[model samples]
Target chain A: TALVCDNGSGLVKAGFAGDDAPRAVFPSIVGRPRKDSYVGDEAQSKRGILTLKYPIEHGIITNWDDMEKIWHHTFYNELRVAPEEHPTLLTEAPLNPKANREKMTQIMFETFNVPAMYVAIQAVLSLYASGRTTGIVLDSGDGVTHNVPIYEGYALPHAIMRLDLAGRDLTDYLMKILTERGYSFVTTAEREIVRDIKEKLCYVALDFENEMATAASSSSLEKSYELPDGQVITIGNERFRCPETLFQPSFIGMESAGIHETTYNSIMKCDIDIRKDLYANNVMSGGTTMYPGIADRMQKEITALAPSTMKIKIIAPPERKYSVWIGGSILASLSTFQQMWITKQEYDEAGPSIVHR
Target chain B: TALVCDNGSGLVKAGFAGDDAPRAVFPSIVGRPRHQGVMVGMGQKDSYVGDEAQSKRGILTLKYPIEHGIITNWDDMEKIWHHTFYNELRVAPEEHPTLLTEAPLNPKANREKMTQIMFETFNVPAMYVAIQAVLSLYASGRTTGIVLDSGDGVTHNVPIYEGYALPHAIMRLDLAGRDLTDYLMKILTERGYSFVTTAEREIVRDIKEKLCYVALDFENEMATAASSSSLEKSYELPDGQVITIGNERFRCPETLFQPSFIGMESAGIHETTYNSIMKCDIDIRKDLYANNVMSGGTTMYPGIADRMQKEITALAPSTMKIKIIAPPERKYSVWIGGSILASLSTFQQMWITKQEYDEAGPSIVHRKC
Candidate 1:
């Protein structure tokens, strides 16, 4: 048996390899209510001066000590299995430092005593879940957005792009809009309330200009949301305007290209002969990509940018939130992948650098 | 005479009112000798502040009490402030009024806390905490304008109408000088020089400031850089090693125009300015466009104002006229403005007096200023 852990900056998904979905899912933050540290779901409802900290920042593990504790919690409480019982597979961000990879390898074997381990690139895993070995995987998570081009199971280094805007930033944009309308909410403490409102009420408009035009004349587009205190607040054009930043970043004062333009740029930067293949299999993953009309808008915008003879399609599976984990599960459970895992004996003999081979 | 202090996350500027320039300007940092908790607070015996602390780095555990334009550690902050009064300005706290500048959207609690400290700790004759944007505008000798202030930790786009800041119109970009310096460090690393060490980081910042410049036309200049070696410059380190700097000079500051270079989600300074103006009332939008004021240490980059005007012009409404004012001494504009304001007899009554703090407590700041 093998264990797959899709550790994200915002949330963690971990479970047995053969399972269709993760058995354990919780936020990536560790909350210290006192001297005792609590992780996973146990940290969510703690009272008093519970200081919370994320082990990861911008898709990289900045605090290994906190990450070790979180992993211990996952193995002992969430999965209810010892680390030595199974081979482990973890997903990593693109452009990750080699030192980080070495550190992860050392920690998994030397500390957890895992029999074997594999660290897979997140974008490659996302592409595999979409049933394509070659495509442009545009993954936007809580911390950042990444555009990675994969060709025949390998990622292209030079064409990879990262955008710093994502779900967390959009939520902040929504809060800014709400505050401008005279709704007084505390910045840090009330973010969850605002996030829920954003998730439920906000969406991308298929025709932004047309929707904005109609919204000005009629009140039909307004969405009424009741706060935790029972006061109903009406959201108007802000619903569409909030997600509009993903399409036109300048809407939120970001100067970078939108997701569509970035996708096209990534494709254009690739080898000219395979650009069409990339356009045909554009895959969307991560929680932020689940917004209604997002895939449709991506298709429309990318189609408009391509040549008349060119074909463009955006593939978004229903289980995209667990896409990376699903891919890891599929790979780790396969008979062919067994030989690829770095065994404990090989690690002990050759050290952490053996993983590179 | 009144003491004017522009307390920033990067540097603290201090001087008496009516001066042409600050008498003292130094990095806002505190240093303490490692493993010595015997000294109480930021004591002179073991702890150092400003220049003294900066010089003692590597040998001491340095702490930047401020983060993203706000004070996070009051003890270290007090030590720095104490250093300004005694070591720099040589003024007795009870002798004169003090005018201090604050970042935008500073919480009321912070204002109150600063007031209490000024009264209870420093025992000043009177004190006024002024917004940095307003003081910057006053530095430009204007009441209505849009000020784009980018310092070490943060950048703020503040729209002021007749000297009153519009809270809702403010836009903040979290990336600034420190991020830019880090980006330059990344560029140099790729070019085969390691600047990952603590001391090397400071050296890289100096290299960036001396060699970096804004490209009037980024794409064209990039093409030029790729084709020629004219863009290259050199810097010598303290260890007697000179490193060659090339296109990094342009690439470092280009991150401000294109934040994606460093993976920052915020827009460039120009777009931020345009968005800020769009949020204001239509009646005052034109005024903001005409009197756009540039301040803060990060705005000192050469050709920055011209680049700002051009980029803002491209984003703004076609017919609207955009004018950006980049004063020669904007690096200390906040302190200069405070100097001018506090020196006025008319502004003497505006200070939150000790009597008012005795009755209403620290909250009196919110009422009086």
Candidate 2:
């Protein structure tokens, strides 16, 4: 029997006893109420019961206590996975925090009484799914953009880069714009409405200069956006033209290196041969890659900046939503990965020293 | 003598021939932007220029037309506005339309100077200044509507007839929201919550939105509001903390209905109505005016309806039929009505004749029309 745990910033999926797919899935958030029992989604849904605190921000769990409690409840109480039943495979972010790793290890060994546990980065899992020995993997999640290069099963630390740009920032920027435009209808209930608008309405302009001209034109089609409530606000095409601000900060008076430029900067940081290799086998995987025209836009912008001799290819997963999960699933099936597991016998013998390896 | 023609949304106030006050003040709103230019100060301060465009989403004006409606000039109005005026406008919301009108009492020289500045900076045509009170009167179709225009500045009530203002009926209230904000600032400092600034008065306004209400009984309401429990009802601010606004009892909207709440026997709306009717004379009040029209941003509150109805009825005789009408709170109604008014022959006659425009010039002649 195998155990698989896929913990994402948005959701968590766990399986046990050689289950083909995940047995349970829940939102990766915890809530604390002012009084009475502390609960999660169930309590949150029960009107005025709980005020939610997002333990995970930007695809990483910042609060360990709440996250550990949730993990224990999901794995032990829900899945009924005991210590001796099977070894656990936990998915973590690339370049994991040492303190967070230590807390996670302690939870598995001390709290859950797990007999054995093996931890691996989600990026490595994605690499395993792609069956790639050497390639560049761009993992864009909620909080940060993670660019990892893998040579065989090992991740290159020197080549890895993390940028504080992600879906959350874009969502926040859109919300700010909407609020300023007299659309002060943001309630907790209408959060999904705002999110849907951000996802569906927002688009990256390929030729920003040309797009601006089109937006500025007197055409009715350019100046309108269909709201989630089915009300078409024909403010002008300029209303939907926010994505251009990412490239040109002067458009909104913000100063930052754009995503495309940042991507190129990351690639250029590598050796010339590695840069060429990186472009030749570029893999775009993560929540943000699911955005319309993201993959295409990245390819077009990066290609324009790259050397003429370099060949650039950007490939996305078949199910872009489950790319990271499938990657972790495939990695869990690896025979060689069994050696990476730290059993109870070894843990007891070495204590904290076992984690050093 | 300085001739000031100040154009604003509610009222266009014009001072000519060294008059002690404005000779003519009408609504300043226009139906649309005079010509295409970026609407600044609508949303966030760091906003885009041009028509209804979203940030980072639309075409950015690179070589924005600055001077003489030409793109590639150093005196490009669009660049200057975007770089200078637009930059200053960013201290407020950067989003929203730039269809703002100026003060009617603004001098022709200043207006012309501003026009030149905007034309050079944004490369747009001349902007129209719509009068707020005239638009309110026009919206209600009252030939003889008494306009009470209150905003950040002073509150002035101008009585109009046959689509023209009766200068004698105009009354001024020296105190307004800004004064109230200052008073609140001083009171709040004494009470704690000392981070209050002129800029953060909007925060106080927001608190007033949730917790503040018109008092039916001023003394009783003040007594109830003085308690800590009533203060606890204050909404949580953006900073994840609730500010107990017991101090809001001394604010404007509430004070308008209950003047005694702030320790003054100044005439409430009831007495004010009686006084205004007497001042304007019963003949004009009874003849053409069947309805009492209430317009302006301050009159749109949920509490204003019951308060105005009760007070006006108390002031009028038992036999008299008193009707009250409140127009939409948006600033566009005046320009919308002005556009309609300009098209009508009778209303057009009220405007300065082209011959008069050519003779006395746009300023002095424009006021008489």
RMSD of each: 27.6, 27.4
Off by over 4 Å in 2: A16-24, A35-40, A43-51, A76-84, A180-182, A215-255, B1-369
Candidate 2 chain A: worst 10 consecutive residues by lDDT?
A234-243
Q: TM-score for candidate 2, please give it.
A: 0.45
Report the lDDT of model 2 for residue A318: 60
| Highest-scoring model, lDDT | 1
**lDDT (Cα) of model 1:** 0.82
DockQ of each: 0.01, 0.01
Q: Estimate each model's TM-score.
A: 0.49, 0.45
Reference-based lDDT, residue B203, model 2:
53
Tell me the deviation in Å of residue A219 in model 1.
Answer: 99
Deviation (Å) of A189 in candidate 2? 1.5
Report the lDDT of model 1 for residue B68: 81
